[PDB]
Amino acid sequence: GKSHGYRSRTRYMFQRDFRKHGAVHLSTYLKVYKVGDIVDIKANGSIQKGMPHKFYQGKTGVVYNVTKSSVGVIINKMVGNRYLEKRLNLRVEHIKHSKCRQEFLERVKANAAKRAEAKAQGVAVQLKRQPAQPRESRIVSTEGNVPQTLAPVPYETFI
């Protein structure tokens, strides 16, 4: 027949990295998790208790519950034509912090610092980011950089 289990088709997914087997480094257990923090989910093969499902591997979610050694994650799963929230409790081991949120707090702090300093005089704060604008005009000098003529090479039958 057909087989669709809790750990089906995870042979290369729930597997430790090369030369990275054994116990887990004592850094994950020292991370402090609070309600509202955004974290990523990455299953670890050494610990088989509280392991997330295949779908929730690599997903990013907010923390809503704190337990002895576990946190609750809310993940939006697309079923049919709608997104449904899923509150799943996972161990600390199979969860890591997300650096995008930290970059957001850093940008916010710099944003407020610039809003203070620039507005102390009140001129062109320009607190908003901009994309890659087209390059402006430039002048190139051929002092020791004379353009070398290039021609296509003949076809060769090297073996």
Added chain:
Amino acid sequence: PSRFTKTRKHRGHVSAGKGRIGKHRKHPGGRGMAGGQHHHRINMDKYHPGYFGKVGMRYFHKQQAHFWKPVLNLDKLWTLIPEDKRDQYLKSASKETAPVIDTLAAGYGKILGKGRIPNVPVIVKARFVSKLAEEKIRAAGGVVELIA
């Protein structure tokens, strides 16, 4: 009716509003309530839970006369008194003369405490009373008389 019935507008259409791939044949799912645990179990479990099975014991020859206990809350207690004297008895808040209500005669066999009746003396006669209703009435200044 017939003029406003959609059949008149459906006249001309071959299927008459019943489809082409599936024609309006006889009962395809059965007659009446054919199937409640085999093919209509999904609907019978997601819309009408509790249809199949027995719950309690059996009460043979259950007469609906022993359970005739109409309820009347405290807020709708002064409505039984006629309006022409309701205001008079509202302003006359004295213990020597208070309005008397016969809830049994009004058709209510039980009084429940809800409504925060005004602090006026009153007399209420009922077959059954509740603890909260009695406490509220006695705090207001009235008394509850037990009648049969």
Added chain:
Amino acid sequence: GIDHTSKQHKRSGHRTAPKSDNVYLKLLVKLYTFLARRTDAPFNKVVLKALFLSKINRPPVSVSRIARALKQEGAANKTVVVVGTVTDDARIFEFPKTTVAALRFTAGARAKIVKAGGECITLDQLAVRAPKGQNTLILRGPRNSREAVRHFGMGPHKGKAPRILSTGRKFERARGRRRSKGFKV
């Protein structure tokens, strides 16, 4: 042709002009349309929009609810406006003086207001006194308190008043509602 990003020739989804054939209601609707078109007060537009509401969308407003609304700070000297019917509540005993304008007034509610010291005016009189709706307060009754909306959205693990005719034992209280006969909802 156009790769349409939305439905073509779609209706606004709102009710323009009353569906009823009440001549007085149409006259009031015309008057409030004139007001809301030649004035700038949003009160006229709100009243005109509420005049198109159906019976289920226009629940009755009780005198107790009116008193509760007027009990707010600074609302004592305000004109209550109810787009619908004003009912009488026997659970209240002290009704303050007010001025309530509504389409239809229950006889008991009208008697209660008259005895308290208020008056019952219509929407036309309310417009005449306050063309811009000055010092008015709009009251709407509970719309979700109907018995027909409890059955809406029925599903497992919802508890949404299954549609039944009889009540009591052995009436949709068996397997599917208890853990002793299988599953619970």
Added chain:
Amino acid sequence: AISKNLPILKNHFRKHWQERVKVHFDQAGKKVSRRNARATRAAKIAPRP
């Protein structure tokens, strides 16, 4: 047979009920006949009530 969120109805029409349909088309006629019989009895039984 079984459909969306509708109530369960118990309709007791499965025998030959079409042969036992009693429609009281003679309500007014029966009332008139009863009144006439009452008047006739009152006339017959003398001033007795």
Added chain:
Amino acid sequence: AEQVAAERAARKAANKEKRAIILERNAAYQKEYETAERNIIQAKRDAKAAGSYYVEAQHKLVFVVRIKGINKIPPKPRKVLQLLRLTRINSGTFVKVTKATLELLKLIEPYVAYGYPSYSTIRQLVYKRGFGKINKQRVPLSDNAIIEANLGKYGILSIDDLIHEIITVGPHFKQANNFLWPFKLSNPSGGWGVPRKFKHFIQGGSFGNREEFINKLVKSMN
């Protein structure tokens, strides 16, 4: 009731003052255009003369027209076209050049032709097929009053000001472009010039970037 003449005179005075400001601003814009063009030309000349090469700045504005029908379109390019306001064939919009816009154009390149427009073709487009968006309606622009009323908050009050905002990307270029309805052009008068449109410009077709060659196609289609 004789004050009609007084209001007429006041209206004429206000209109004359407004026209004076418009004329001054138009003269300033024309002087700036001539100065910029001459400055670029002489900069190229000095770069050539001094034993160097002048690398012109990349064009900051492009014009994109749709050359494909609304049938047999993949969903992601279709959505990108809807977001870029290209729902009719032979419809054109102006686009400010950024990284995001460049990657957007790289996705729907097969169904559009885009290139760097010039001041003359921009002015011709705005004059002939220039339509605004007021109250979600396509009201034609035949006076500066409507433009001032619908764009005066951003410092734009005339058709020449709108053209200036289009050609030179500024603080309010987004609003200036959003106010303008997409230009519904016709088929080219002299033809597309290629036997097969659905091939790249280097491959011999209208599909793909045309750079400065888009001006001739736009004027032929307009």
Added chain:
Amino acid sequence: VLKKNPLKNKQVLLRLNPYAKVFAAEKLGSKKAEKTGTKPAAVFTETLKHD
């Protein structure tokens, strides 16, 4: 009631652009540039024809 096209109706063109009259009077559409002359460097001259 009807849309008149600029660049073909002089009245509408003048109404839209008051500067059109000054432009036509000064003939700014055909302006002679300064008669300046610069010579390209020998490096560029040789690179042009370097095969």
Added chain:
Amino acid sequence: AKSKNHTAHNQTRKAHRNGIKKPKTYKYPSLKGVDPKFRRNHKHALHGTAKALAAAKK
């Protein structure tokens, strides 16, 4: 008489006709699945701060 078993064709279009909607978020989320001790202490703290606010500002 064999028949087609399973196919995902047109399912994406069917789901996209009515655009896929993100769940509606609220300022106060549901408090289910939370630690019972934390919920009890939150109830006690909420009662305390409500009483303090009522006593302070009237």
Added chain:
RNA sequence: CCCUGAAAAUGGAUGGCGCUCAAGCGUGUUACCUAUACUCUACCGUCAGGGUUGAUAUGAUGCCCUGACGAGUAGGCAGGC
């Protein structure tokens, strides 16, 4: 490029007529014809945004202004004989 390889049964298919510095083959450039496709205009219907009780004057479900769109089986709704 062309030729042998390369043989199926009613009489027939680059559509055929026919074509040989092609009207065959690859590539380069202009002009020419057209779809219910594109731009404008006239009319009808639908939708949206509005004006119009300061009248004798009626149909404010009436009149007028502006913009956009108009395919279709089963099927739904609405207006009419």
Added chain:
RNA sequence: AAUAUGUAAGAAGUCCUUGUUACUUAAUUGAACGUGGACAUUUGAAUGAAGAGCUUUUAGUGGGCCAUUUUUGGUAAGCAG
């Protein structure tokens, strides 16, 4: 690798002071909810949006096929998947 895919790009935010708890901490030590107070041009990347959100009812549907690309069974199939 490419493609495909999740999250964040702000007022439901940030910062200063300090009220509550039966949670917790050696402990006013942390957590949640708070009060007061400060930050509206440029409210915190680009683009777009005949506006968006929400509820009820129900007709028909539950036999598909073909086209590019990836690809299973089969020598192949206008074969099946």
Added chain:
RNA sequence: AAUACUGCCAGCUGGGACUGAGGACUGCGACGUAAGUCAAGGAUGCUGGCAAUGGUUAUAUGCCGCCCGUCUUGAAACACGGACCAAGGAGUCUAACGUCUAUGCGAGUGUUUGGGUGUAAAACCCAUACGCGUAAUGAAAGUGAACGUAGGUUGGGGCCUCGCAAGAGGUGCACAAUCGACCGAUCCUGAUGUCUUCGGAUGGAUUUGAGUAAGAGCAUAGCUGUUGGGACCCGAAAGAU
């Protein structure tokens, strides 16, 4: 120097086709120092011919065009029914209902079971009962909803005040989520008293309800849908008396 190529002209001008919508003025512009004029928010002037143009049908010409309805992914098929015309012909009715809409009354609602009256199956009037709702939860015994301005907080139309406007503060009906309070069941702890086994005050629950928290319901009619009935119409091979 000229010329080829590309791009510009708010430079001029020759020729041809389609269109004439709107109907006293309202606006934006130009000429004219000024009167006034204009190609400036949709065409007028003059003149000629007749009092034939054009509508319906038949034929002819250039082009296009397979047989109606059903089944089917695929019909015109060598798949099915049709020689023609005239008459009849197919989602109707009842009982209980669901959503919506209209009317009447409204914490009440429904005369027509019946009685009186009656121009006589018409119409009018009426007392008590009765149907549903106003209280629900448990198998049942039973019990039975305000610590509060009928709670706190956020979002929230409207209203009030300040403010030239914009904006700021307060109240915020309806409705969305969450935290609280009370009622029934279950698990618990157990205050006085006492027919020593009765009585269940007070304090809780990751428990549970088709609850309360200023009622919204009842009657009739209308579209659509379901059930039972012969059930949109027609058709079996069978069984019994």
Added chain:
RNA sequence: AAUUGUUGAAAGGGAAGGGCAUUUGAUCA
């Protein structure tokens, strides 16, 4: 009405019937 006979009109190289536009014949304000 199906069907049939006469009179009057039209067409007819292995079908008839229809649509897009017009000439001709008959008729029409």
